[PDB]
């Protein structure tokens, strides 16, 4: 019941879905990378700052 | 079972979004399935439908679709009176089924071989013992009724059709004088057993 | 046209895989940088306290 144009529309629709999920995933991962960057920086810097203060 | 029907080339494999489902469409509605499947659910792959197998009532067709539309796909397919099979490609289960059947059939043949020899020997011995038992029943009754020394005249007959009455009348007149009343259902004036073959 | 459909979808899957792998690579790099910067601050703190100690000593 669907023509070549419509089947192509459906294929594009599915690809659009795939691309949207790909973009959301990449953005979410980058945001998490930023969060973990700051988290690890805090953990590390406080851990060793504490050690420094103790040696002091 | 689809073990002998479904091939790896029937399913869309290694897809992130797509799954291939097999749905049985009655042959009368085969074209309707082919025409309708493309529009049964949102986000399905058009023109992907093909036929894996057919029988006298229906065709089994595979469709590739977005995973999350499968619920709508199978729901609406059912609404249009198409039946979806609960099947996904699985090489190990089909191979296991094929070998298990091949093994059990061979095992049947292998036991058959020894089966007939086993049972035929057991029969031979069972029949030999059977008649041996009857012979002993003859010995015991003959001695028990006539005393010793144990010299009796035992004989086998192969009765002729419709002569049972005559044989009984003859045997009775021939031997009735020995018992007169000790021996219908089993009692005759002589040792008597039947062999049922 | 069943193969063209899946061709398009698997290429989209490929792109998605590349996108998320790259995002994970970025995460790994950012986390290493984060550790390096934290350690740099730790060294700054160390130098400051070491300087006060030696001054007082």
TrEMBL record, chain C:
Domain of life: Eukaryota
Residue runs in coiled coils: none
Ranges of compositional bias, category Basic and acidic residues: 33-53
Location in or out of the cell: Endomembrane system
Sequence similarity: Belongs to the V-ATPase G subunit family.
Subunit structure: V-ATPase is a heteromultimeric enzyme made up of two complexes: the ATP-hydrolytic V1 complex and the proton translocation V0 complex. The V1 complex consists of three catalytic AB heterodimers that form a heterohexamer, three peripheral stalks each consisting of EG heterodimers, one central rotor including subunits D and F, and the regulatory subunits C and H. The proton translocation complex V0 consists of the proton transport subunit a, a ring of proteolipid subunits c9c'', rotary subunit d, subunits e and f, and the accessory subunits ATP6AP1/Ac45 and ATP6AP2/PRR.
Function: Subunit of the V1 complex of vacuolar(H+)-ATPase (V-ATPase), a multisubunit enzyme composed of a peripheral complex (V1) that hydrolyzes ATP and a membrane integral complex (V0) that translocates protons. V-ATPase is responsible for acidifying and maintaining the pH of intracellular compartments and in some cell types, is targeted to the plasma membrane, where it is responsible for acidifying the extracellular environment.
Protein name: V-type proton ATPase subunit G
Organism: Rattus norvegicus
